[PDB]
Design a protein around this nucleic acid. Structure first.
Ligand SMILES: [Mg+2]
Ligand SMILES: [Mg+2]
Ligand SMILES: [Mg+2]
Ligand SMILES: [Mg+2]
Ligand SMILES: [Mg+2]
Ligand SMILES: [Mg+2]
Ligand SMILES: [Mg+2]
Ligand SMILES: [Mg+2]
Length: 1306
RNA sequence: AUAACUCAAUUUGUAAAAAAGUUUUAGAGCUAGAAAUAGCAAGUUAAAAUAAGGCUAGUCCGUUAUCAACUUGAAAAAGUG
DNA sequence: CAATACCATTTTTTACAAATTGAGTTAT
DNA sequence: AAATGGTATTG
């Protein structure tokens, strides 16, 4: 009887029900409630609308940040508990004053000066120590006994802001010997190159290298002090290495292979090992010198002070910042006095200007302040202040955005210094030095997670003992090993074939043997003599493995031929059938280990298999080297200490697909052979793992054969689309219920298809490329949003097809070409797009860029690939012409993929639907598919609309969502009716190329009468009518023109953050929300703008006047998210606390956002809040006006446009009727009318597009601004909810077919 | 359509960390002059909170998912035209 | 009252697993 | 990254 059409989107699910003749039924539905209507007729077409589903990301960030805050607090508490007793003797209430420092004097228990308790001592303190860093340095360097409170302040300041943990081990600053070290590097280099020596030259290496410029700049200056020495040269590269940069050494050493070294990267020792093996170890001392120079210079950006003077170079550098700020401030003030005293007031007094006053007291940033005074500085006569400005070193504060560079090791250094200094005077500091250091030091390992005790959904850590966990007892109380193990294993896949078995490490030796053999097994070969291509035998395979795979990292086909087939079988020439260029599989771990253990015979020994598998397992499972070592301790007797040291560092990540038991555990009953045995040797049939697993003769297969919401949430994809999936399932259920619990014949489903990342991509790709184009043409992140500019930079300001430069001022003349033409592949991304001055230079139009273009441009594309400026996909598409380009079969494939859905998520949807609809099995125990789920791509219905002029304009209303579903149902049912053999492609469940091409390219022709075709379209085998050109189109037009369509906005309780996060200053307003229980916002300030979880109808009585008369009230109260739980626990008490009395509890109506209300003339409003409403109506514009608008915005149709210009006036008339009846924004409507009146002279096209603009005035939901032409219309908002309180509440089903209407008269 | 491998791009989810920002308080402003109001002097730092808070009391948890109305359920969801 | 203009926490690092897309080899 | 509901201020 009926089929269902569905359109699944991120914010919408369109739905429709059709009959055998493509009609949508109209049914009478019962209306519940206290209203007049007992029923309403509804057409069975509509669309569900809903706010986007959100990722769990923001929540994760908030949660983790929370944990950070509490843990920092705990650090401070530990510190205070250590200091407690000895502080009690010095100061009774010090810590108390510290914790109540936020309180106003009126609220304080103790006196207002935190540190010392009186004015004189406090002022004295601040006079002696203007910044905390002054106190830090003094406490580090001095020898005098210090006040315990000052000591605490220093220690606490270092602990509260400890710095990062990105560098392992410890640092011990030594800026002292940079000159001697640089001279030493130059020395050893000159030794190694006796022929040509570099002159030390009195080059102030210290100044240039520790200067506050970027690494690269300092390099340039350094080699600028060097004659005949280029930055790309050997020594230049070495200097770059010492600077913490990543240089490449291959061009210096004639190496074909890349040799890039970065001292910070953990692979440095090994990369350098390989380089030295390639070039000779007489170059080792050179790199040693580079490293030695690197250590003394490592933290030059941070320290800025000679390490001789102090043991606190950081705090000293901060003190420097302070002093320079001071001096330059005195100077600047003096200057402005002398030369521009008129602007002095704006600079040093006005907080709102971005001056120095706005800088210090206002919310102006260092950048904004700098930008403010740049012109002031340069216009005056000041020359050095600009230098400081360009250095970003003008008037610096100590607490800045760029202090994230600071590693915890330096704060640790100062901490330890202070501790050593004052432990001489305070014994408890001596006894507790290690604890305190460990407070700053300790960090919960990421592989351990939250230190929970059975109440954290997120935690996995296991306890070695039942103590409360502290930083000092962590190793003893927490089972770190089992915790890391859990960290990885709670996420890792189990073998699907053997669900109880863990998957092997990807770099497992066994797994790679399995992969290499699984690949080798299907390799065939032919020679001149033999009569057919032959498999490799067991013997031959072991030969190839032992000789090639166990000697060469990768094994090429050429190596197979020459090194095996030629050398061992005396074949001068041979053909290979199973492998391409080189074997994909490789025994990489075998060679890694071989480099480490140095004992091939140990590896080849079968008895060491378990041990090796355990070692690789340990290497994969853990990455904490300290634990890896402990894991390997058993095998310490097997190899030397150096070998163990090397084995620690070898680390693997990733897990395979299969288990050890599958590969080498299960044995075939008849054979007694494992899978791997069959891969090694299977005689005549060289059977695959796939074959092995499905072979009825073998016993492997049989040995193996041993909630909707959860299911949807478990799928892979955006949560936004998952929301749509759940919604569409529920819609289907309700539709089936509507149709008397009869299942549909068919269900047709369709599914819908920055700047910082771009700037990063370009910066890296260019730096790697070595291009100056960023320096020549500076960009900003928001400029790259332009496609042509982004491309331009991705191609290094070059033509992609022609090997010539492009112009940044001529992009409008240039073309964006699709690499594989749009007709075949609907790809709009950068992976398929290219900037060239003209697309003709691509070559042919019907294909991949031509062979000439490939030949001429290939290497450039290689460079772009290596700089990551183009991906591999893009490259391989660019270069396809040297593989014959696009084959006709590929063309056909692209065409059928244009209309046949391959997306996995949609297949999941189709499967969910199919499994819900078909639940019965026949007498043969096979599924009875009563309902056919059909999946269509958007192109079918889009093309159908264009061809037969069923035009779509999204902005008019939300009806198009439903219309698309209707057309989906129609077109789908028609398609399967006409071509039942196509069931395999479009329906869920279980020469020629040109033919396929034409076929799929012309599949939708049966709808047309002339392209000639009969008026009636029927299916040959059954003769059943599929289409009737004489009436079915008319029916479609009737359906699309149907005025009433069930568009339902999903009512939703608002969730998430309580309010805006901003912490506002104190203000006299009841809107201000306390940040803490005792913190009155009139005194302390706080939060603002809370989010309404849901409104609530209250009818009750409230006091009025001094005498507290009981007046009667009916009103909407917004229950905020923060208030929610309290309101649910006991609503009566909550409402009574709000000031309501005699609350009629039974009349309480929960009103979530988007609640629907009908009023006077069909006029509707949706609940936006407790104090604002949204538009609740859909403007049903006649199809003539929609089609006319489509044609006018974008020859017979042109003359149709010119013939029907009166349609504009009729459309605006429609809009006006609508607005006056429903929108009620007279002023805005008058501005619309006026604006249209002024622009009647303008071209019809423009006027039409701008008429399209006019519809947001009439659109459903939140009011929004729009421009008619140059006239901007501000939104008319609905700032009151009074009328709704006497309106009619409409409770809607998911389809909106069932309604309960409540006349809110009470 | 499925399975393993290779190369790459992407998406989702989790953990451990860092630097700012903000808000109050503390950094005795000063001479004049009744008084606003002038003139100058100043400014870089710190403490504390950073979802209100919760019981399960852990160096744990608090912003995702899910939600018509009536009847039933704890809850999912069911039962109703 | 309701017309109106302004506002909205930001940024960084490390470690990890799973899908999926889509170009290839081999198979059910 | 909008955009759209809160807020103070004005009209
Ligand atoms: Mg659609
Ligand atoms: Mg807290
Ligand atoms: Mg600050
Ligand atoms: Mg290959
Ligand atoms: Mg590992
Ligand atoms: Mg939610
Ligand atoms: Mg701060
Ligand atoms: Mg509803």
């Amino acid at each position: 009887k009926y089929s269902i059409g569905l359109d699944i989107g991120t914010n919408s699910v369109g739905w429709a029900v059709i009959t055998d003749e493509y009609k949508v039924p109209s049914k009478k539905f019962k209306v519940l409630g206290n209203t007049d209507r007992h029923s309403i007729k509804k057409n069975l077409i509509g669309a569900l609308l809903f706010d986007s589903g959100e990722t769990a990301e923001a929540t994760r960030l908030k949660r983790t940040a929370r944990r950070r805050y509490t843990r920092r607090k705990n650090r401070i508490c530990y510190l205070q508990e250590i200091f407690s007793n000895e502080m009690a003797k010095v100061d009774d209430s010090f810590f108390h004053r510290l914790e109540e420092s936020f309180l106003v004097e009126e609220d304080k228990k103790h006196e207002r000066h935190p540190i010392f308790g009186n004015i004189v001592d406090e002022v004295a303190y601040h006079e002696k120590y203007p910044t905390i860093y002054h106190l830090r340095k003094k406490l580090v360097d001095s020898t005098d006994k210090a006040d315990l409170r000052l000591i605490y302040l220093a220690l606490a300041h270092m602990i509260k802001f400890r710095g990062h943990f990105l560098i392992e081990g410890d640092l011990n600053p030594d800026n002292s010997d940079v000159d001697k070290l640089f001279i030493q590097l130059v020395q050893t280099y000159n030794q190694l190159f006796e022929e040509n020596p570099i002159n030390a030259s009195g080059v102030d290496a210290k100044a240039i290298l520790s200067a506050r410029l970027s690494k690269s700049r300092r390099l340039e200056n350094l080699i600028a002090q060097l004659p005949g020495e280029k930055k790309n040269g050997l020594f230049g590269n070495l200097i770059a290495l010492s600077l913490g940069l990543t240089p490449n050494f291959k061009s210096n050493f004639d190496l074909a292979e890349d040799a890039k070294l970065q001292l910070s990267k953990d692979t440095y020792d090994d990369d350098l090992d390989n380089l030295l093996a390639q070039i000779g170890d007489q170059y080792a001392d050179l790199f040693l010198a580079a490293k030695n120079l690197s250590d003394a210079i490592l933290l030059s950006d941070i320290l800025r002070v000679n390490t001789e003077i102090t043991k606190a170079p950081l705090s000293a550098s901060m003190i420097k910042r302070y002093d320079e700020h001071h001096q330059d401030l005195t100077l600047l003030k003096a200057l402005v006095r002398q030369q521009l005293p008129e602007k002095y007031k704006e600079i040093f007094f006005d907080q709102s200007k971005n001056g120095y006053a706005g800088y210090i007291d206002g919310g102006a940033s260092q950048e904004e302040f700098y930008k403010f005074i740049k012109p002031i500085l340069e216009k005056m006569d000041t020359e050095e202040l600009l230098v400081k400005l360009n250095r970003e070193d003008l008037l610096r504060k100590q607490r800045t955005f760029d202090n994230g560079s600071i590693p915890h090791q330096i704060h640790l250094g100062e901490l330890h210094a202070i501790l050593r200094r004052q432990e001489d005077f305070y014994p408890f500091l001596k006894d507790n030095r290690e604890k305190i250091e460990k407070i700053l030091t300790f960090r919960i390992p990421y592989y351990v997670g939250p230190l929970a005790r059975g109440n954290s959904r997120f935690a996995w850590m296991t306890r070695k003992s039942e103590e409360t966990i502290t930083p000092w007892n962590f190793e003893e109380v927490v089972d770190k090993g089992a915790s890391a193990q859990s960290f990885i294993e709670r996420m890792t896949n189990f073998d699907k074939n053997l669900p109880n078995e863990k998957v092997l490490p990807k770099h497992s030796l066994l797994y790679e043997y399995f992969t290499v053999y699984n690949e080798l097994t299907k390799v065939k070969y032919v020679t001149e003599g033999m009569r057919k291509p032959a498999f490799l035998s067991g013997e031959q395979k072991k030969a190839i493995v032992d000789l090639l795979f166990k000697t060469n990292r990768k094994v090429t086909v050429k190596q197979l031929k020459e090194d095996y087939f030629k050398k061992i079988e005396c074949f001068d020439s041979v053909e290979i059938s199973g492998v391409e260029d080189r074997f994909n599989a490789s025994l990489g771990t075998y060679h890694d280990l071989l480099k480490i253990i140095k004992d091939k015979d140990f590896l080849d020994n079968e008895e060491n298999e378990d041990i090796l598998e355990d070692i690789v397992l340990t290497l994969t499972l853990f990455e904490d080297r300290e634990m890896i070592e402990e894991r390997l301790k058993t095998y310490a007797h097997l190899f030397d200490d150096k070998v163990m040291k090397q084995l620690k560092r070898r680390r693997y990540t990733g897990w395979g697909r299969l288990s050890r038991k599958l590969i080498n555990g299960i044995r075939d009953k008849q054979s007694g052979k494992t899978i791997l045995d069959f891969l090694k040797s299977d005689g005549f049939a060289n059977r695959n793992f796939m074959q092995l697993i499905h072979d009825d003769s073998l016993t492997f297969k049989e040995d193996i054969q041993k909630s909707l919401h959860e299911h949807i949430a478990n799928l892979a994809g955006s949560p936004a689309i998952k929301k749509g999936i759940l919604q569409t399932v529920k819609v289907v259920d309700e539709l089936v219920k509507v149709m008397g619990r009869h299942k549909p014949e068919n269900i047709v489903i369709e599914m819908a298809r920055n700047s910082r990342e771009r700037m990063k991509r370009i910066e890296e790709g260019i730096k790697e490329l070595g291009s100056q184009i960023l320096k020549e043409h500076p960009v900003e992140n928001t400029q790259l949003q332009n496609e042509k500019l982004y491309l331009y930079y991705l191609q290094n300001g070059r033509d992609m097809y022609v090997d010539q430069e492009l112009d940044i001022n001529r992009l409008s003349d240039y073309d964006v070409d699709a690499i594989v033409p749009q007709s075949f592949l609907k790809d709009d991304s950068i992976d398929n797009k290219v900037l060239t001055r003209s697309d003709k230079n691509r070559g042919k139009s019907d294909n991949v860029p031509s062979e000439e273009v490939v030949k001429k441009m290939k290497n450039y594309w290689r460079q772009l690939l290596n700089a990551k400026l183009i991906t591999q996909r893009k490259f391989d598409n660019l270069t396809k012409a040297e593989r014959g380009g696009l084959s006709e079969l590929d063309k056909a494939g692209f065409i059928k993929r244009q209309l046949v859905e391959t997306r996995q998520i949609t297949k999941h949807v189709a499967q969910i639907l199919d499994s819900r609809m078909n639940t019965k099995y026949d007498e043969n125990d096979k599924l009875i598919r009563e309902v056919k789920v059909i999946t269509l791509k958007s192109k079918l219905v889009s093309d159908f609309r264009k061809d037969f002029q069923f035009y779509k304009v999204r902005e008019i209303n939300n009806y198009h969502h439903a219309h698309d579903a209707y057309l989906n149902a129609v077109v789908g049912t028609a398609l399967i009716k006409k071509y039942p053999k196509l069931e395999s492609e479009f329906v869920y469940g279980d020469g020629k190329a040109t033919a396929k091409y034409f076929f799929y390219s012309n599949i939708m022709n049966f709808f047309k009468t002339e392209i000639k075709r009969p008026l009636i379209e029927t299916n040959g085998e059954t003769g059943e009518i599929v289409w009737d050109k004489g009436r079915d189109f008319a029916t479609v037009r009737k359906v699309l023109s149907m005025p009433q369509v069930n568009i339902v906005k999903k009512t939703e309780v608002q969730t998430g953050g309580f309010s805006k996060e901003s912490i506002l200053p104190k203000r006299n307003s009841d809107k201000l929300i306390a940040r803490k229980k005792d913190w009155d916002p009139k005194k302390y300030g706080g939060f603002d703008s809370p989010t309404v979880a849901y409104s609530v109808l209250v009818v009750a009585k409230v006091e009025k006047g001094k005498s507290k008369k009981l007046k009667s009230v009916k009103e909407l109260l917004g229950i905020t998210i923060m208030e929610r739980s309290s309101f649910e626990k006991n609503p009566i008490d909550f409402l009574e606390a709000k000031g309501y009395k005699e609350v009629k509890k039974d009349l309480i109506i929960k009103l979530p956002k988007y609640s629907l209300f009908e009023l006077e003339n069909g006029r509707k409003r949706m609940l936006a809040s407790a104090g604002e409403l949204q538009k609740g109506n859909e403007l049903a514009l006649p199809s003539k006006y929609v089609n006319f608008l489509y044609l006018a915005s974008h020859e017979q149709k042109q003359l149709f446009v010119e013939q029907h210009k009166h349609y504009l006036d009729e459309i605006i008339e429609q809009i006006s009727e609508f607005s006056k009846r429903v929108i009620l924004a007279d002023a805005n409507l008058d501005k619309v009318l006026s604006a249209y009146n002024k622009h009647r002279d303008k071209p019809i096209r423009e006027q039409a597009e701008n008429i399209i603009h006019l519809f947001t005035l009439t659109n459903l939901g939140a009011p929004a601004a729009f421009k008619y032409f140059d006239t901007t219309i501000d939104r008319k908002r609905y700032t009151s909810t009074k009328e709704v309180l006497d309106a009619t509440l409409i409770h809607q089903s998911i389809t909106g077919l069932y309604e309960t209407r409540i006349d809110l008269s009470q």
